[PDB]
From a paper:
Efficient transcription of RNA polymerase II (Pol II) through nucleosomes requires the help of various factors. Here we show biochemically that Pol II transcription through a nucleosome is facilitated by the chromatin remodeler Chd1 and the histone chaperone FACT when the elongation factors Spt4/5 and TFIIS are present. We report cryo-EM structures of transcribing Saccharomyces cerevisiae Pol II−Spt4/5−nucleosome complexes with bound Chd1 or FACT. In the second structure, Pol II has generated a partially unraveled nucleosome that binds FACT, which excludes Chd1 and Spt5. These results suggest that Pol II progression through a nucleosome activates Chd1, enables FACT binding and eventually triggers transfer of FACT together with histones to upstream DNA.
To investigate the structural basis for Chd1 and FACT function during Pol II nucleosome passage, we formed a Pol II−Spt4/5−nucleosome complex in the presence of Chd1, FACT and the transition-state analog ADP-BeF3. Additional density was observed for Chd1, but not for FACT, and was fitted with the structure of Chd1 in its post-translocated state26. The structure shows that Pol II adopts the active post-translocated state and has transcribed 27 bp into the nucleosome, as observed biochemically. At this stage, Pol II has unwrapped 45 bp of nucleosomal DNA, exposing the proximal histone H2A−H2B dimer. Spt5N interacts with the exposed proximal H2A−H2B dimer, likely stabilizing it when DNA is absent. The structure shows that Chd1 binds the partially unwrapped nucleosome. Chd1 uses its double chromodomain and its ATPase motor domain to contact the nucleosome at SHLs +1 and +2, respectively. In contrast, the DNA-binding region of Chd1 is not observed in our structure and apparently mobile. However, in the structure we present here, the second DNA gyre is no longer available for Chd1 interactions because DNA corresponding to SHL −7 to −5 has been transcribed by Pol II. Displacement from DNA is predicted to release the inhibitory effect of the DNA-binding region and thereby activate Chd1.
Numbering used by the authors:
A (entry chain c): 16 to 118
B (entry chain e): 39 to 135
C (entry chain d): 30 to 121
D (entry chain B): 295 to 343
E (entry chain f): 25 to 102
F (entry chain h): 29 to 121
G (entry chain g): 16 to 108
H (entry chain a): 59 to 134
Write the structure that this text describes.
DNA sequence: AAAACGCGGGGGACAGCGCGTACGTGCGTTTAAGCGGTGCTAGAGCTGTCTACGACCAATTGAGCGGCCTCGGCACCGGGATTCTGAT
DNA sequence: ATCAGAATCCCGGTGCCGAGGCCGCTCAATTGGTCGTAGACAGCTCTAGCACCGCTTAAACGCACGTACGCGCTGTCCCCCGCGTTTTAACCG
């Protein structure tokens, strides 16, 4: 299994399939799908990290779309890497304008 | 005791950032999307998942637009939001075809 | 016939936060996220190859694609481990 | 109009043009001399360019 | 019959948006803006269905109409 | 050397629509880049659509759907009409 | 020539060649290049017509960046097609 | 004619590229493209900023105006 | 001076007048240099990445155009 | 469970009026910069040889998908404690 | 400065549905080999965009002046809040 032999947890063969049937180039190199699998794996791990930490801080042991939404938006960077993305049934960060407070 | 104007408004704000369930009323949105697609193709067909996706992207649009409108009013030393605020928000955004 | 990154998201989560899980709808979001990032990276690699008169999407094309999609605080660590995977694959 | 004049000499006698209507309807697929010779060519099929 | 998107609904969406006060005309203008956005997404969706030859908009066709306008939706397939 | 540009063809169209007017090297470059952008966009749309329909071929109906999505409207009908006349007249010969 | 027999000013053959070489799909329909060339020709004709009209309004026989950009931006149709596009050396409406 | 000023722009571009790479060697066409794109961006942004001032009942643009324009665009 | 200041106050002025600005505040100029600065960082970053991939030691107008096209503002005129 | 009407009520809009910082506007300087012109030589951009690389094809099998089935866990409720809020 | 009255909040109880595990056998994976040809590499000719310097002169800098507008303050009165109450459309079997 190329996933095992490349030490990954994502499917080397599957990303190779998808690079084929997407018609992205006439040929696909041997190393490219492994690298792409690694990148996808690590992005997966990191967004899941933020989600799990959000769940723990919510005292709450389950990833739901709100938890993914906070994991995406609270990070200053992933907010705008997924800025054009809309996570389904994730609310918005609880921000309120300072002038819009009773005083 | 009579609540002063504004505090329950903040309360609804906080409640609706805490909550996450959809907020546009779903059967009226079904009727609206059905009659809006009718004009684009007679004898047209929707499913629940597709209508849910439309309603939910719609909710995303309107919350983002209201971020922009509120923020524009705040920049204009305005706490209310006005149609001019919405129009400005949109026409900087570029969706005013 | 459905095709998804189900067991792989599960395996990553059970590897890194063993006490947590991933719901069905959270999984659907995650599947869309993986498919979307894959489409963006692969499309950029294809465009890079077309620009460079290249008929192969090599690890170098994926290198440039990831470094050029993920803008800062990403694609330093991600590139380092991607290269680590490709290198020790070639070793093994 | 030159074709229909070469066919039906008496313009007042509409009946010939009426029966010719399908012909000119279905023959519009060619509108140039070179294309017409070339269509006789496609049906000639003599391994030609 | 545009009134289906009701005044409390626009109100609450604004409160999710952080609005503290809402002028009266916001409701009508907001429904109008909503109509425009809906036209924009339905046009692409029904186009995708006509491509598929089918009658019924699939969630995939929804997602693709939405990704056309640079507003990607996550969760509904991929 | 053989350069990849839509020079002569844009010239031909310009003389057809405005025989007196001419276009210079720079403006030909503007037209060439614009046509390449539009053409890349349509072809990418067609390929994406064939993919999402699991169809591994491209055709006039793919381009139908691509043009109809891309062109905003009130030239969508015109572009479809002229493309259709071209494709029926092709399939004849 | 496919274009000359087609009565379109754009290269159907070279469009087919690029569709093959662009990794867009493994096979390309016969009518797809024809349709795409037709739409490209139509859009170029429309923009060139508008540019020539702007040049006439400006009393100039020469179509310059300001003519092309002024056409694209005055015309709401092309404006919505190329709103997020910038024309080199092009002035403001 | 172009208004962001030629040689100053080229040197600004040179030191910006210096950080990303060394012995990096631009093209004249590349510099022209960069200047034209930046010109277009800034004219668009000042158009937005003037909208913002006009809505705030002001004729002179302001810092807050340009930051409003940016954080509604989204790059901020 | 440092070349960020090379973009002169009259240049910022002419930009604003083209975009329709009647008056410009003295605080505008620093921030215009800032937004110009960040946009150039982005576009040059993508362009240099393109060259580095191409094994080319010379930024190219096609690279700039490709970078701008990704950032969302296609530039016509320098195509090839 | 939510929308829709209605009433009094507070809060804030909008307009006006003043003052003063800030702005635009000359006035010419000093500055620097087209738009020529110098001499490079980095490094294209192109060709040609030959290798490892990758694309297809059987043959073999083990990861994934759908189906099926449990039971933790979340949403739910009432009831109880926490809480930020004027009001006088 | 103070405490009454709504909303928010803590815990834990019971019910239900989906998550996560298991099972089979489908399908594409994984060797193993072969062939063609795309790229790496080496090498050459030639482009072109440095680095600077003239020279004229448009443009930028600095400074000084006058006044149109930014921001603040005050005042009035339209226009919403924030309930309570009464319809109403919707709710999910």
């Amino acid at each position: 299994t190329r996933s095992s032999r490349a030490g990954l947890q994502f499917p080397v063969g599957r990303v190779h399939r998808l690079l084929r049937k997407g018609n992205y180039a006439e040929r696909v190199g041997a190393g490219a799908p492994v690298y792409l699998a690694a990148v996808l794996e690590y992005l997966t791990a990191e967004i899941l990290e933020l989600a799990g930490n959000a769940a723990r801080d919510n005292k709450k042991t389950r990833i739901i779309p709100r938890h993914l939404q906070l994991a995406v938006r609270n990070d200053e960077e992933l907010n705008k890497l997924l800025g054009r993305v809309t996570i389904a049934q994730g609310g918005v960060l609880p921000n309120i304008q300072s002038v819009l407070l009773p005083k | 005791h009579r609540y002063r104007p504004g505090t329950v408004a903040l309360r609804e704000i906080r409640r609706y950032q805490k909550s996450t369930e959809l907020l546009i009323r779903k059967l009226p949105f079904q009727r609206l999307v059905r009659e809006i697609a009718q004009d684009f193709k007679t004898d047209l067909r929707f499913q629940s998942s597709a209508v849910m996706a439309l309603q939910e992207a719609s909710e995303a649009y309107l919350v983002a637009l209201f971020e922009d409108t509120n923020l524009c009013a705040i920049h204009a030393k305005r706490v209310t939001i006005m149609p001019k605020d919405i129009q400005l928000a949109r026409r900087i955004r570029g969706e005013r075809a | 016939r459905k095709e998804s990154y189900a067991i792989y998201v599960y395996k990553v989560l059970k590897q890194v936060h063993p006490d947590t899980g991933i719901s069905s709808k959270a999984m659907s979001i995650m599947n869309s996220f993986v498919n979307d990032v894959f489409e963006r990276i692969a499309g950029e690699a294809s465009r890079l190859a077309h620009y460079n008169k290249r008929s192969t999407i090599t690890s170098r094309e994926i290198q440039t694609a990831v470094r050029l999609l993920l803008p800062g605080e990403l694609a330093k660590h991600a590139v380092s481990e991607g290269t680590k995977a490709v290198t020790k694959y070639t070793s093994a | 109009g030159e074709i229909l004049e070469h066919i039906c000499y008496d313009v007042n006698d509409w009946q010939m043009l009426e029966m010719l209507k399908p012909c000119v309807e279905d023959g519009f697929v060619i509108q140039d001399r070179e294309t017409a010779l070339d269509f006789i060519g496609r049906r000639g099929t003599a391994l030609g360019i | 019959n545009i009134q289906g998107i009701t005044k409390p609904a626009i109100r609450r969406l604004a409160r999710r948006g952080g609005v503290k006060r809402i002028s009266g005309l916001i409701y009508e203008e907001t429904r109008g803006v909503l109509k425009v956005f809906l036209e924009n997404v339905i046009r692409d969706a029904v186009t995708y269905t006509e491509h598929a030859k089918r009658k019924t908009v699939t969630a995939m066709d929804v997602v693709y109409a939405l990704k056309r306008q640079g507003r990607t939706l996550y969760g509904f397939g991929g």
